[PDB]
Amino acid sequence: GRDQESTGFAWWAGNARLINLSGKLLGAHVAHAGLIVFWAGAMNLFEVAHFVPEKPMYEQGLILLPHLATLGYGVGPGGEVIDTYPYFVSGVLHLISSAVLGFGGVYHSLVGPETLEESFPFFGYVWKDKNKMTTILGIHLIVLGLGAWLLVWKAMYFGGIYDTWAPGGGDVRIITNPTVSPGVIFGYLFRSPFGGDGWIVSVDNMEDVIGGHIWIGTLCIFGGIWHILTKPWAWARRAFVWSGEAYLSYSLGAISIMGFTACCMAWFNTTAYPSEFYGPTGPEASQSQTFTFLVRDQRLGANVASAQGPTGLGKYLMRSPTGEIIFGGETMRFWDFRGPWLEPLRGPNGLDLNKLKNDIQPWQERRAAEYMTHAPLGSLNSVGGVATEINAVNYVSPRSWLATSHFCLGFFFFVGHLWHAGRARAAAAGFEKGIDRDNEPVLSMRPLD
Amino acid sequence: KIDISKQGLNSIQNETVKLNLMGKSKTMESKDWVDPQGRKGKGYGVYRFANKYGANVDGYSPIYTPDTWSESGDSYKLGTKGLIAWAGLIVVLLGVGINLVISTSAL
Amino acid sequence: MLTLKIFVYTVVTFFVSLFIFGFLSNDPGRNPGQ
Amino acid sequence: LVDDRLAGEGTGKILGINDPSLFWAITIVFTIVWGVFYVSTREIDAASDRENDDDFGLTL
Amino acid sequence: KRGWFDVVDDWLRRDRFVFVGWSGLLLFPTAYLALGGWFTGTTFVTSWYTHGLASSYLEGCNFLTAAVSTPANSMGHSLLFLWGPEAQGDFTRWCQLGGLWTFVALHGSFSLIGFMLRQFEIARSVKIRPYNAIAFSAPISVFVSVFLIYPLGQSGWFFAPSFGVAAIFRFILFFQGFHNWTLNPFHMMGVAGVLGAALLCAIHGATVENTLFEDGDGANTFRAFNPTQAEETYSMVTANRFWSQIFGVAFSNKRWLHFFMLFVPVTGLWMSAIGVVGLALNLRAYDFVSQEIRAAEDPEFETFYTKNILLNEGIRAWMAAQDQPHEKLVFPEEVLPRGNAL
Amino acid sequence: GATGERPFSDILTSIRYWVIHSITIPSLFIAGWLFVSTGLAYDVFGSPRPNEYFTEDRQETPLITDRFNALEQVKKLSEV
Amino acid sequence: ESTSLWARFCEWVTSTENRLYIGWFGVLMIPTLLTATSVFIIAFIAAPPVDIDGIREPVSGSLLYGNNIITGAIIPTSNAIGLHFYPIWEAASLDEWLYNGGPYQLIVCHFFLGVCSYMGREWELSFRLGMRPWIAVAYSAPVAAATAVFIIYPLGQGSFSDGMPLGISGTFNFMIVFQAEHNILMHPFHMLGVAGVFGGSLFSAMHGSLVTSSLIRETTENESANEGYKFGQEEETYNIVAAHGYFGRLIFQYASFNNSRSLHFFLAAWPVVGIWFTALGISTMAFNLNGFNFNQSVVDSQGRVINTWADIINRANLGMEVMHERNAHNFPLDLA
Ligand SMILES: CCCCCCCCCCCCCCCCCC(=O)OC[C@H](CO[C@@H]1O[C@H](CO[C@H]2O[C@H](CO)[C@H](O)[C@H](O)[C@H]2O)[C@H](O)[C@H](O)[C@H]1O)OC(=O)CCCCCCCCCCCCCCCCC
Ligand code: CLA
Ligand code: CLA
Ligand code: CLA
Ligand SMILES: CCCCCCCCCCCCCCCCCC(=O)OC[C@H](CO[C@@H]1O[C@H](CO)[C@H](O)[C@H](O)[C@H]1O)OC(=O)CCCCCCCCCCCCCCCCC
Ligand SMILES: CCCCCCCCCCCCCCCC(=O)OC[C@H](COP(=O)(O)OC[C@@H](O)CO)OC(=O)CCCCCCCCCCCCCCC
Ligand SMILES: CC1=C(/C=C/C(C)=C/C=C/C(C)=C/C=C/C=C(C)/C=C/C=C(C)/C=C/C2=C(C)CCCC2(C)C)C(C)(C)CCC1
Ligand SMILES: CC1=C(/C=C/C(C)=C/C=C/C(C)=C/C=C/C=C(C)/C=C/C=C(C)/C=C/C2=C(C)CCCC2(C)C)C(C)(C)CCC1
Ligand SMILES: CC1=C(/C=C/C(C)=C/C=C/C(C)=C/C=C/C=C(C)/C=C/C=C(C)/C=C/C2=C(C)CCCC2(C)C)C(C)(C)CCC1
Ligand SMILES: CC/C=C\C/C=C\C/C=C\CCCCCCCC(=O)O
Ligand code: OEX
Ligand SMILES: [Cl-]
Ligand SMILES: [Fe+2]
């Protein structure tokens, strides 16, 4: 290693001593990737070993297994786990590959070449060499595009992916006609983030997901090819700071945005995050509660359409601010919800009174009751229910865990982007270690008013 | 004003750690020194006014001075017989304690 | 109401374009460092 | 109906454009500012006493 | 030094790892006894016979729910000595009756007195000014008004805070429900003082750390300082210009800056103490009579103040039965205020 | 500098120190364990065991009503 | 000499000779903040009642409608609207716009953009003056707290009506309802935030008193020491060694800070981390991850429940829960 004597960086900032050491930096990155794969495999093995078939996935605190279920692995019609062997296979493969990755990282960090700019010119680089950095960026863009295309191939030729909107209940479908319309793809991208619109979180069928992935794979491959063959222009050289910490800050900001988007998608989406494996969402539980109370009160001989509440608005059915027929109560704020068990009862102008008066199905009622009781509310020590409940239920929704953790991560990485962007801009200018007593900039300016 | 030799940091084996504790670094006073990110040095060193005030804050109030350590304590006077007696006593006490914990509990 | 929307859109795009094209105009070079 | 309204909230339009006039306003203002910047970006660069070669920019 | 006083002063005011001083004789025993009493009460002593709860680790409570509980309301304002006419020398029954709370409080007050005296003595020995000793008056006033004056103006020690986390939370919620403590201007000044003190601390730390001087060649700037140096380590001119162009106003006097830093939280805490002293006699700024009259005459007038009033009413009605066992309040379920479907 | 006591770094890295304190700390730990397990903690400080919260006489929470007869009242309430 | 119109405009915008720095972030900051300020003042003075719960029960919050400073507020947007975008041009008339709670959304959006631009402008002036750019990082804690109470909580609860009102009594109502629904007092992140503010006050008073106690004599007794300090002077005005000696004899030697830079970094770091954690706690509780629930935890041998201070807190929460909205609920569970 090194020391503060010959570096100027303390032990709590020791990873900054390998900014200009290409081999050791590569070793550190490979070791970290091995750590990530190790966690994936170990967590998959931990979750597969603690899974019982008498309870749904969201009732047992699983977050990695529902990811494999949505890919159509070991699941059946209706969203019931049938086989649990592919999860074991995936976990074993990840855990074993982590060993190779960790060995590579340890080798490159301990006994590998310290600075690979003289023995391996192809892999060597300088942070200020724009062409080499752009070439590396293009290579990794090509790799990511290949990964997106690999995801696309699964839904088409290798058995497909789980579709929660499939006719006759959710099942593993095959996507034959993806939506590759420019108007459809641009509609999701340049949509408002507010209610009703929802930006890209509002994607409501797997055809749109597969079409967007085709688009993103093609774009990434083309951009990688473009960057391999070119170098930044004058307007780009005039606008950016060119150093390793600057590149790190850019990446930190990008992945902070990604983390916030992931949190929102986990909280709100139902297509890519089926409720069969993640439980009901926020609005879904409220809509289910109103639906089941309407059904129960209708079974007791009541007129749900003409029933009037304490405020005079409607106990079960009211009108949305645009005219659509929606559920009444405080769930009037969640009328944008759209779920597979509720859509069949919805007509062109909202809920159909005759359909919910004569054509409500027992499976719909069971889904509504289950999503009502398993609402995404809980406590830090995993106690289900509102904050004024008793210790009877040990449950916290998998959506809550992912949403909270990823919001925290996104905020902290935004703060990291701020820190590193500021430090890079200051260090490149040349005053990151303090002000110069001999030449203080403020002393040379005219005093203010 | 401050004598570095009288600060009690002369009994440290590791030269780099010794230099770290006095707030000194021979590498950094060179005009051609470059830190990991790639910034040249102005020859100040760790502290600009090291000659004016004697030493740094590290060389002013150290918290690890092996010179002031007691001459005894680096060797056990009781020797091997004391260690053997200690081993016997700790084995006996551990047995007695585990027996008492098991007996006083509900098995 | 459409006139208000057009006016607000014009104002917002004016200010955002000013921001973008000002930060694109060799901003890192405006520092007192030597 | 009793009155009239734009009726566009919660629809999912690209950039919220329901009328081409908004697109025209955005494009015209952006183009004006871009042209003003484009005329002067040559003079602005020359204030650094350096040429915009491959080594230009703030580097470390 | 030949006299008894002289030799005792020579030994007491010695240069040592732990300074004892003349005030140590009052500080160390009382502080040790208060800490030990709190730890013993939270670990072993219960609260079943005085409050009807469990407040110890022995009974199955964690760090948050363990506390030293106040005596029963029947005891009034009794000082509850170990030898008093209630415990009568019985240690176990003294612990069961709630005498450990008064023990801890009475020893803690004298420990606070001894600590301010120690601050004064150490300041005088080093020949500096006693502004640190002056600053402790705000915590001492807060402790005196909350733990002594407020219970002394109530039914008894039963309504004092209990030395615990969840007990303090219950005390806070009780103060909200019954006194409308959030609507007290003195509490508003206290909140402003505390938040402004935090603001000042953060902003001063950041401003000093980001206007440093280049006194070294290393990126670790903590090693470019020496306490005996003459020149200041940061640029006051640069800091002043930055904050003048960003905020509009800025400090130009270090002494005034640091006195303001001292002045803000002390004043906030003193104002809150005055408010609690006033609240000890149920002199609460609870309601606005004009708003109540307008809402009574007009069934359409509603503001957030009325909603807060309803919330306080619900808190009182639903907490009264268990929080005050001595009143023996039995409330039928149909008299408790309640909303629709909730 | 130093106020005239042995440095903590010197003491904590001593064979004598770790020979003396390989007995005292475990002895205190075992003493506390035996204090709790032998029932002394309940008897000294008067805390109720899990089976002594409610007696056959009263099935409600205790309440002390008299200030000067408090000793006798708490003696009666604690009766098993 | 600048000649182009754009070059002159850039030189003026990025000028360090202005009385108040403009910058490129100030270009975004000034109009948004002015818009929010104007709408806030006009609504606080003369706005009509706003239907906040969507149950046709308007709530007054304006001075002209029978309120004082303590009682006045800006009522959040209607519950019927939800998270939908409600700009001024989406209303049939200004009378309808003011009835549903438009000004709250307008002010909230403009204020969020303005505070983000304010932090950016802090960085910008730090760069232009030749400083180190982390005063902006310090400001991120209050920025995150404001975002959490104004944006993230409505985002997770599905409506802007669950947002914090722009008033005093409205703030107290927000706090009480938050406690009744999430048990915020039992949240470790709220405990960390409380520790942060209490420690910030402690350390601010401690530092101010220690610096004021070591002032070197440069005046007489008929004038203040502030007159003893001269702006722009080079020598230090107080005895760091004397203050360190006093503190190290007050507690013990190795507890005080001998390094002024380290002491000021600690002063900066404590409250910032505390507020970061409390804002993270609010944002986490937005997605219904409440605090510790030690209700009916202590149970005796026969199975009966022994109460605790946590149970008393639960009784208070039940009291303030069944009354936070009297007529807005038709079903037993508050799932939102
Ligand atoms: C180009 C630059 C930006 C330009 C535009 C800027 C506008 C700024 C306006 C000012 C106000 C600030 C922004 C407010 C955002 C509010 C987001 C919201 O109400 O909701 C967020 C939306 C969620 O949309 C939801 O999407 C849902 C999707 O619908 C459908 O979703 C599924 C589809 O299958 C299901 O079928 C489901 O039933 C169905 O309803 C619904 O439509 C909901 O009504 C809808 O609200 O997420 C999303 O847009 C995805 C994630 C968005 C970004 C991250 C948001 C969280 C972080 C905030 C910022 C950082 C804070 C921390 C740092 C602080 C310090 C700096
Ligand atoms: C260091 C100082 C100190 C101080 C100030 C206190 C203060 C207090 N203690 Mg604590 N205490 C201490 C140390 C101290 N304690 C020690 C070392 C122990 C041993 C563990 C205790 C154990 C203890 C117990 C067990 C109790 C207290 C309690 C109290 C209160 C006692 C009330 C009383 O009537 O006092 C006595 C009154 C006085 C005024 C004494 C002063 C009289 C002067 C000196 C005249 C001397 C004249 C006399 C006629 C002649 C004697 C001389 C001759 C015998 C040689 C008071 C708040 C009580 C409590 O808190 O109740 C809730 C209680 O129960 N204390
Ligand atoms: C995420 C993980 C991580 C990784 C991969 C690295 C990586 C690296 N660190 Mg950093 N570091 C980290 C976290 C990490 N660090 C943290 C948390 C801190 C704060 C304490 C630091 C502080 C720090 C300092 C102060 C320094 C480094 C340095 C180094 C580099 C040189 C290694 C070396 O010389 O000493 C390795 C020393 C040893 C011989 C220990 C070997 C133990 C091995 C590696 C354990 C892993 C083995 C595993 C159990 C089995 C794998 C085998 C396989 C077959 C399965 C290395 C690339 C050095 C540097 O700057 O280089 C120029 C250095 O000066 N780091
Ligand atoms: C991994 C991510 C990635 C990254 C980090 C970069 C990074 C960079 N790109 Mg590359 N690029 C990528 C992927 C990426 N690119 C892809 C996928 C493509 C194919 C479209 C390109 C095509 C491309 C071109 C054509 C150019 C660059 C340039 C640059 C540089 C300028 C920075 C900049 O964006 O200005 C900051 C960003 C802006 C001012 C605004 C951009 C935001 C756009 C306009 C949003 C709307 C999207 C757009 C209309 C595309 C359609 C959407 C889609 C659905 C079809 C920088 C080195 C420039 C250059 O230097 O080339 C050598 C340049 O001229 N890139
Ligand atoms: C993408 C290029 C970015 C270039 C650099 C930008 C730098 C920053 C500039 C300032 C940005 C903030 C102010 C913006 C104000 C104008 C926008 C506005 O108010 O729109 C508000 C309008 C609302 O539009 C509404 O639409 C309704 C129907 O849907 C009705 O028609 C309403 O009348 C209408 O107002 O929304 C939009 O214009 C949609 C914007 C979509 C943006 C997609 C960006 C995709 C690429 C980036 C992806 C990541 C984005 C960040 C995500 C994480 C965030 C934490
Ligand atoms: C575009 C700009 C964006 C941000 C704008 C910010 C505007 C606010 C500025 C307020 C300055 C007022 C200072 C007065 C006093 C004054 O003149 O200050 C000036 C004072 C000068 O200090 P000196 O070192 O020169 O003093 C020397 C000594 O000898 C004094 O005796 O500096 C300070 O104390 C800074 C602390 C200001 C703290 C102000 C906080 C806010 C106050 C509360 C606001 C209530 C609003 C109610 C609305 C209904
Ligand atoms: C350099 C460095 C570092 C780092 C490091 C790292 C990060 C590493 C990693 C590493 C890694 C990352 C590793 C890994 C490994 C792995 C392995 C070794 C595995 C194994 C496995 C197995 C053996 C399995 C088995 C099985 C099967 C087959 C089936 C089922 C069952 C079981 C599970 C049993 C540190 C920080 C120290 C610092 C200094 C420097
Ligand atoms: C897959 C998928 C999809 C698709 C997607 C896509 C296709 C996307 C794209 C995306 C994109 C395409 C994005 C972009 C972005 C961008 C950005 C975010 C930018 C930024 C920028 C910046 C930040 C800048 C800055 C600046 C300025 C302004 C000034 C000067 C300086 C600088 C340059 C720095 C969908 C949804 C359909 C469905 C689902 C799935
Ligand atoms: C009552 C009384 C008394 C007194 C007593 C005493 C003085 C005692 C003491 C006692 C004591 C003196 C105790 C203590 C205890 C302690 C403890 C129980 C501790 C614990 C700790 C912990 C649990 C820790 C934790 C942690 C960790 C591990 C990590 C980091 C953070 C912390 C540090 C928090 C007398 C007889 C005089 C008289 C009568 C009455
Ligand atoms: C000289 C010809 C060369 C290039 C011109 C090419 C294409 C012009 C195409 C479209 C211009 C109008 C764009 C309108 C966008 C949509 C507006 C709306 O949604 O109302
Ligand atoms: O609005 Mn305001 O507070 Ca959210 O929870 Mn449901 O809704 Mn209403 O109640 Mn609770
Ligand atoms: Cl409802
Ligand atoms: Fe200071």
PDB file of C-alpha atoms in Angstrom, chain E residues 202-249:
ATOM      1  CA  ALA E 202     -23.678  24.262  10.882  1.00  0.00           C
ATOM      2  CA  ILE E 203     -23.148  27.497   8.951  1.00  0.00           C
ATOM      3  CA  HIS E 204     -20.131  28.570  11.023  1.00  0.00           C
ATOM      4  CA  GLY E 205     -18.474  25.174  10.706  1.00  0.00           C
ATOM      5  CA  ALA E 206     -18.991  25.082   6.944  1.00  0.00           C
ATOM      6  CA  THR E 207     -17.885  28.689   6.412  1.00  0.00           C
ATOM      7  CA  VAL E 208     -14.696  28.269   8.436  1.00  0.00           C
ATOM      8  CA  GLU E 209     -13.865  24.939   6.800  1.00  0.00           C
ATOM      9  CA  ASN E 210     -14.430  26.299   3.272  1.00  0.00           C
ATOM     10  CA  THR E 211     -12.408  29.534   3.591  1.00  0.00           C
ATOM     11  CA  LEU E 212      -9.177  27.983   4.872  1.00  0.00           C
ATOM     12  CA  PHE E 213      -5.663  29.082   3.932  1.00  0.00           C
ATOM     13  CA  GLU E 214      -3.089  27.085   1.974  1.00  0.00           C
ATOM     14  CA  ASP E 215      -0.590  26.257   4.721  1.00  0.00           C
ATOM     15  CA  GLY E 216       0.486  22.874   3.355  1.00  0.00           C
ATOM     16  CA  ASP E 217       0.925  20.687   0.301  1.00  0.00           C
ATOM     17  CA  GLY E 218      -1.399  17.816   1.254  1.00  0.00           C
ATOM     18  CA  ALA E 219      -5.065  17.351   0.452  1.00  0.00           C
ATOM     19  CA  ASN E 220      -5.657  16.583   4.149  1.00  0.00           C
ATOM     20  CA  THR E 221      -5.999  20.134   5.462  1.00  0.00           C
ATOM     21  CA  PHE E 222      -6.267  19.156   9.141  1.00  0.00           C
ATOM     22  CA  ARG E 223      -2.462  18.935   9.395  1.00  0.00           C
ATOM     23  CA  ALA E 224      -1.739  22.533   8.317  1.00  0.00           C
ATOM     24  CA  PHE E 225      -2.512  24.055  11.729  1.00  0.00           C
ATOM     25  CA  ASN E 226      -0.641  24.818  14.950  1.00  0.00           C
ATOM     26  CA  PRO E 227      -2.508  26.051  18.054  1.00  0.00           C
ATOM     27  CA  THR E 228       0.295  28.442  19.070  1.00  0.00           C
ATOM     28  CA  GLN E 229       0.400  30.192  15.687  1.00  0.00           C
ATOM     29  CA  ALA E 230      -0.374  33.892  15.331  1.00  0.00           C
ATOM     30  CA  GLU E 231      -2.106  34.251  11.959  1.00  0.00           C
ATOM     31  CA  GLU E 232      -5.722  33.198  11.586  1.00  0.00           C
ATOM     32  CA  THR E 233      -6.274  29.977   9.664  1.00  0.00           C
ATOM     33  CA  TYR E 234      -9.167  31.171   7.460  1.00  0.00           C
ATOM     34  CA  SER E 235     -10.081  34.238   5.404  1.00  0.00           C
ATOM     35  CA  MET E 236     -12.595  36.417   7.233  1.00  0.00           C
ATOM     36  CA  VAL E 237     -12.674  38.855   4.302  1.00  0.00           C
ATOM     37  CA  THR E 238     -13.539  36.081   1.845  1.00  0.00           C
ATOM     38  CA  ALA E 239     -16.187  34.638   4.167  1.00  0.00           C
ATOM     39  CA  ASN E 240     -17.759  38.069   4.661  1.00  0.00           C
ATOM     40  CA  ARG E 241     -17.862  38.783   0.925  1.00  0.00           C
ATOM     41  CA  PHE E 242     -19.343  35.367   0.129  1.00  0.00           C
ATOM     42  CA  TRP E 243     -22.123  35.715   2.681  1.00  0.00           C
ATOM     43  CA  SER E 244     -22.760  39.354   1.744  1.00  0.00           C
ATOM     44  CA  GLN E 245     -23.291  38.460  -1.907  1.00  0.00           C
ATOM     45  CA  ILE E 246     -25.276  35.276  -1.175  1.00  0.00           C
ATOM     46  CA  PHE E 247     -27.499  36.245   1.772  1.00  0.00           C
ATOM     47  CA  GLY E 248     -27.344  40.043   1.870  1.00  0.00           C
ATOM     48  CA  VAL E 249     -25.833  40.473   5.330  1.00  0.00           C
TER      49      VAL E 249
END
